[PDB]
Amino acid sequence: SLAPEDGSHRPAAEPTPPGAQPTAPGSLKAPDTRNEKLNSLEDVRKGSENYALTTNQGVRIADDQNSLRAGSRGPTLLEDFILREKITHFDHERIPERIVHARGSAAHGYFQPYKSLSDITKADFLSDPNKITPVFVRFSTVQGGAGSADTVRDIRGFATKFYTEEGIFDLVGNNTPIFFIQDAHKFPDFVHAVKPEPHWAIPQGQSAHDTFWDYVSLQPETLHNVMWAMSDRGIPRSYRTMEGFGCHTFRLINAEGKATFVRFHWKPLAGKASLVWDEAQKLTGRDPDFHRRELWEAIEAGDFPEYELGFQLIPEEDEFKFDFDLLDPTKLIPEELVPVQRVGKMVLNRNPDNFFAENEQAAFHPGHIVPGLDFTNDPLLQGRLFSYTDTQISRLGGPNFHEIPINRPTAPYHNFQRDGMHRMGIDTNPANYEPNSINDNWPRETPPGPKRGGFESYQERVEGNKVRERSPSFGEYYSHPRLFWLSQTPFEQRHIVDGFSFELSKVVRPYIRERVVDQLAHIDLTLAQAVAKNLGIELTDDQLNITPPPDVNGLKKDPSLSLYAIPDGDVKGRVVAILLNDEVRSADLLAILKALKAKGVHAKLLYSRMGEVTADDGTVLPIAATFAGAPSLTVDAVIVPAGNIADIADNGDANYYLMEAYKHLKPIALAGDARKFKATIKIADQGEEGIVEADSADGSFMDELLTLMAAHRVWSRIPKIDKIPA
Amino acid sequence: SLAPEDGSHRPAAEPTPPGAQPTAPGSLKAPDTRNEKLNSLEDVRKGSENYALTTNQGVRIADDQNSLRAGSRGPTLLEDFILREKITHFDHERIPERIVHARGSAAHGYFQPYKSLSDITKADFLSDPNKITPVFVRFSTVQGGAGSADTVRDIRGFATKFYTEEGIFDLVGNNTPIFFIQDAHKFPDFVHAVKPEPHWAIPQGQSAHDTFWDYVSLQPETLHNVMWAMSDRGIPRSYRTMEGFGCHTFRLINAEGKATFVRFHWKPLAGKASLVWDEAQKLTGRDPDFHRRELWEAIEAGDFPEYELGFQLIPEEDEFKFDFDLLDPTKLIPEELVPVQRVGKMVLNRNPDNFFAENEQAAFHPGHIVPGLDFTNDPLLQGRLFSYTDTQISRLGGPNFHEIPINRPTAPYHNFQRDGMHRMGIDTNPANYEPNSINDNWPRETPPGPKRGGFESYQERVEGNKVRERSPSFGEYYSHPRLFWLSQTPFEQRHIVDGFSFELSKVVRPYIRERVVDQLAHIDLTLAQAVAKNLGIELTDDQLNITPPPDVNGLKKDPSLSLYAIPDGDVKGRVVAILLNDEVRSADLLAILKALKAKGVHAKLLYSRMGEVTADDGTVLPIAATFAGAPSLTVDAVIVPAGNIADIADNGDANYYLMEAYKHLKPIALAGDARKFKATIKIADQGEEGIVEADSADGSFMDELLTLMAAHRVWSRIPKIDKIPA
Numbered sequence A, B: 001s002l003a004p005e006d007g008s009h010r011p012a013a014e015p016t017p018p019g020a021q022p023t024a025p026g027s028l029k030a031p032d033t034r035n036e037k038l039n040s041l042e043d044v045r046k047g048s049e050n051y052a053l054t055t056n057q058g059v060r061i062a063d064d065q066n067s068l069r070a071g072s073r074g075p076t077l078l079e080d081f082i083l084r085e086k087i088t089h090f091d092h093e094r095i096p097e098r099i100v101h102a103r104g105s106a107a108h109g110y111f112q113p114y115k116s117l118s119d120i121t122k123a124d125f126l127s128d129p130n131k132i133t134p135v136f137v138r139f140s141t142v143q144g145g146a147g148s149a150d151t152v153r154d155i156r157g158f159a160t161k162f163y164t165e166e167g168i169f170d171l172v173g174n175n176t177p178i179f180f181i182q183d184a185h186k187f188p189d190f191v192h193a194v195k196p197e198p199h200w201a202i203p204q205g206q207s208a209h210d211t212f213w214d215y216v217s218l219q220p221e222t223l224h225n226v227m228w229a230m231s232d233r234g235i236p237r238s239y240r241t242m243e244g245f246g247c248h249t250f251r252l253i254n255a256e257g258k259a260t261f262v263r264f265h266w267k268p269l270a271g272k273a274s275l276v277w278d279e280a281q282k283l284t285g286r287d288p289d290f291h292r293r294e295l296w297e298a299i300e301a302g303d304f305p306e307y308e309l310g311f312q313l314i315p316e317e318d319e320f321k322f323d324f325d326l327l328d329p330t331k332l333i334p335e336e337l338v339p340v341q342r343v344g345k346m347v348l349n350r351n352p353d354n355f356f357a358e359n360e361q362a363a364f365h366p367g368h369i370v371p372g373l374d375f376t377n378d379p380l381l382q383g384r385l386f387s388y389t390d391t392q393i394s395r396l397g398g399p400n401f402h403e404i405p406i407n408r409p410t411a412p413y414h415n416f417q418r419d420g421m422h423r424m425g426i427d428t429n430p431a432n433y434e435p436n437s438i439n440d441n442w443p444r445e446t447p448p449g450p451k452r453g454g455f456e457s458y459q460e461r462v463e464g465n466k467v468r469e470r471s472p473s474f475g476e477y478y479s480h481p482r483l484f485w486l487s488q489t490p491f492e493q494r495h496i497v498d499g500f501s502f503e504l505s506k507v508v509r510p511y512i513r514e515r516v517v518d519q520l521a522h523i524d525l526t527l528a529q530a531v532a533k534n535l536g537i538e539l540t541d542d543q544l545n546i547t548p549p550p551d552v553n554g555l556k557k558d559p560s561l562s563l564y565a566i567p568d569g570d571v572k573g574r575v576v577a578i579l580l581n582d583e584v585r586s587a588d589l590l591a592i593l594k595a596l597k598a599k600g601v602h603a604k605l606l607y608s609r610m611g612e613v614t615a616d617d618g619t620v621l622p623i624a625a626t627f628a629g630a631p632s633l634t635v636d637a638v639i640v641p642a643g644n645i646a647d648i649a650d651n652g653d654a655n656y657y658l659m660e661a662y663k664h665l666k667p668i669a670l671a672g673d674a675r676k677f678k679a680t681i682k683i684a685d686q687g688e689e690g691i692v693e694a695d696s697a698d699g700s701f702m703d704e705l706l707t708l709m710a711a712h713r714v715w716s717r718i719p720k721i722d723k724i725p726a
């Protein structure tokens, strides 16, 4: 017995806030959280307590600390099969990572529609508000490896596996509504351009390098999704606080056979929120697992990630009524033109047990649709349909990847396919072909119908010659970039300018920088000039006179394109650093902690060492982490209570904590003599917006602080930080 | 879509300083640099200029921008074989990464011995000072994935493939002289404990988590290599500035059959140098590719990484003469007891062409020895011999991995092995077995002998029973940790204390921290007290009374264990940041660059935007990067020349740049009015050791700066950095 006698090795099986307990496998942390999929995995879950240590063949091991050798200092013997089985399994642990979205964090949960959508789709999962569909969702970056950092600037993946009663449906989306390229044939060119360059395999998790911006400069179709990636969209605060999109027009098909064009949306019920660049980049160093960690701990805390599924619906007759092509995945559909209809709610409420088995091996693919859904001729979507089945053959070792437990349907599956590597199912059918008489032709085809029918494609009219040709309707590249630009707040525009500037600064060949600046001048002159000024480049008279592209169907902005123009803040699940001193005013801390708790805001108590400190009244205060151990990057706001401030007034890390939080536009609250830190961050005596200060933490001090957190960051501070040495 | 007329897309094929040109594949950068191995790869190097784009089948492609579809807005057709090949190759690009050392950076070079070693070994590559052996070296971290960051705290790998005339020899070593564990059977337990924890796959690139410290607290044999990891050895400045070691006792065998025990060493000719932790950690976010990049740019610049191979030699009769067991890989052999004998020099002078094909697919394995070398019964080495061949079967796809070009011997290979996946060699031999008469028994066995003989194992006597039992002589765990601790300088010791304190503070279960502090009390009470204090732990009376372990054969310390105790600085290849203003004093910059050039020290010119600035005399100065884009983390020292200092005096980034450099102990030099920045880092008028200052940058000023750089960091400044908020 190596566990501590007090049982402190084992986390409580109850919701607990981030940092309060060690983290654990989902089925141990929350054994009573269940759904049909999670229950169906029971046949393969393997425990441990009270069991003997064995080989994989079931043979009990006596000494798992030594190899068999001739003499205790002699050579290891080949007959040591215990050693070789153990080292063999280790030697073969790794499987190929995903070609893109290799870095990803996943969780189990459930989806339910608000009402039956039978008038527009026969999809069973959307037929009944009392129908609950288990889901497994993986969120991801795009460029970096499985061991790359979370808070890079990149697009994010948002993939949802719906285990429906009529088959698996995978909605394989991203956190922006468009993609960089129009035709799947170019996907290896684009991906190779953004990925580490092939001579030296640099840079990881970054588009800030020559080949990416070379490609963009030569391929103006890319500029729309580039605008999104250069915006704070590219650096989300949390997977809980980004939007999701299904990227293409698909179709819904109802029982009567009518097709409706649809684009899919996920609205984050925790609101939209992003980091700022210096913070996100520094955070890849201080905690490269910050989003994986945050997702896991939100679920352990009961702050379940929730998202509302929404559809933009376009009648077949209106296919051609927009300035842009509905099939062009570089174009978005503005919500001012086509609103998002709410459809239902997804809640992610349990972590996996084993990350490799459930996360790394999960396979999502947008061809996995069900009756009630269908594709369109979007030529990026079209090529995706080939890729996501093909790539599993090496990634997951063969064509039986649907038998890997996470991937299995909960719906019945029966057919005449046989064999392949790793075959698990033992087929008893006398027949392995159809038509057959020897098993009365079972399993049998099923006519399409209103429910439980076989899949039949919508009979879309095709007409044209066999051509490798881009549609002329796809040949417009600047108006959507411009619509996005004009829809952002002035601070968001500034962050976009700074994103392009920083990235182009890492492009070693200056002519590539110049060429990208020329493209910017085709989108918006102000944008182009500000990026130019940062790069020491002067626009030509010609560039200064490029006429801007047309409005999009008469729109000069659409505020739904902004993260922040329409407030949607939610403080629950956010976190506040509390900077302790060795004699804290206990009445301040009582008022602070209870106000945070009442709003579901977490706290972490920090100090200059671990262990404990004692408050003015003798309360013992446990310390979560040191100032350097848990940097302001990791929190949403900072509170300093009154007390013996002289203890930390000259601590460089304490001061730097405030300067860093200040620079990144985070709310900061100072009570009593903690106001002496005003000098550190240069705050006027009479105060400033975004700094909460009072004689004590009572009265309106916590409300004012929470009000600031609800608006996420203090954008008004931007001109003040410019000159801060931090 | 083409190259600029001015040819600026293409790097000069001549040595150039870091940042002066885009980096490039080795064979294009340095086409005249050759060795026998580099030439033998010419069969598979593929160019590109003037060639038509084709499928893999050699069919020319007319339109690589589009999928074949029925109409230009129609569905993609299954007959588009050009799309499917392209997409299929892309879908299957990734192979499994290495179970450990997945993150690594490699280059080509050559080795030659200083003198014939035929008195001690018949190994052909050590037989003649004029026989040059091509090498391919890969440097690595251990825990993180192939997309994890370089400047983590971790052991580093240092693996060298020697392409000798008598076969491949791989010396597969690390940058510390021991390992954490004694028996290979435990390798998967230790590696699982240090790797990201299985439920949530956190943390990447870090031992700072509960399972690693749990295993260490329970397995005191690990404490020696833990001490090394917690010291600054865990965070090297560069692969060029760390030591390498072979980890085990091997044997040299001479022509007469005499066995000598040997331990291998690599001495960095650029000297020993490491980062400090705050710098290392922050640099994983600012440039997760820093070591990869620095290695590549050093080779492009002509600062070729050079290492001296060295042997510790122990005669056979001396096997039992120390107070530790020679075969125990948790024990080092102190150089005070057994000196390193210099054996020869290795020079890395060319980068690869394609990182995947040459670096990622390279296979190194310490069982790849040649006649003149042999093994010992080290029980860690014994089990490694199984693993490095086994793991290739999944990683490199089968038993023909030696036919992957980078892995091929330059020596002849012929044998009776046939088939396997992706078999390249087409054997014409009528026989595939021996003995055979049908091919007169060729290829034939070769008796052993002085040179060009067949491999025969040294006939070591084996006497003992078949046991799984650790040798009693291995059961001592504290004396080597202690010898290491006592050999460090006071600042090195502080950094070790801080490493343990930082790491344990991230262990969530407090009993684990306590158990580790109890282990530390068995090594040294001062160390144990200093860590305890940071964790808020008080040692018990019993802990205070633990008898320190014995000296190691009479040694109180061995200065060769310290990175810094004996000066060995080499500034060539180091880099300085020069912070520009909009009217640089050209006379200062002239003297600065001239002095740096004389010692082979590089410069990067930084400013608040990109583009150019013009000096006082009209000289146009291109800007390498902004203050934010290339932070003081990435350089060895900072110089601020005179001129229009008002331009940058109030720039927050310029000020921070000096605060960060100062905090990280780097030399700083300030000329003329740049002395105004003294106020940001609180230097008194009198000056301070480590800050160079004068009216202008002259002979004296640059000599002083260069002397400081030869000492790497300004350790005396440590007392003054607590206070700086940076």
Ligand code: HDE
Pocket: A098, A099, A100, A101, A104, A138, A139, A140, A156, A157, A158, A159, A172, A173, A174, A179, A183, A184, A185, A187, A245, A246, A247, A248, A362, A363, A364, A380, A381, A383, A384, A387, A388, A389, A391, A392, B091
């Ligand atoms: C709409 C959201 C989106 C878009 C437009 C694309 N990806 Fe994705 N992708 C693969 C291929 C592929 C192609 C051929 C295209 C356009 C032609 C896209 N992508 C764009 C893949 C290589 O087959 C992929 C890698 C492993 C795998 O199973 O499939 C793949 C991954 C991927 C994910 C991750 C799913 C997961 O396992 O977590 C996501 C969210 C996307 N793509 C979205 C996506």
Ligand code: HDD
Pocket: A087, A091, B098, B099, B100, B101, B104, B138, B139, B140, B156, B157, B158, B159, B172, B173, B174, B178, B179, B183, B184, B187, B246, B247, B248, B329, B362, B363, B364, B380, B383, B384, B387, B388, B389, B391, B392
């Ligand atoms: C019995 C298991 C085992 C043990 C005990 C060790 N190794 Fe190992 N090592 C492996 C099993 C392994 C491996 C699993 O076989 C790897 C990764 C896959 C590879 O080809 O080999 C590897 C890779 C690997 C590499 C990377 C080579 C490259 O660049 O490709 C290095 C430098 C080392 N090891 C160094 C060491 C040192 C200094 C050890 C202490 C003596 C050591 N290994 C013990």
Ligand SMILES: [S]
Pocket: A177, A178, A179, A246, A247, A248, A329
């Ligand atoms: S998309």
Ligand SMILES: [S]
Pocket: B177, B178, B179, B246, B247, B248, B329
């Ligand atoms: S080792």
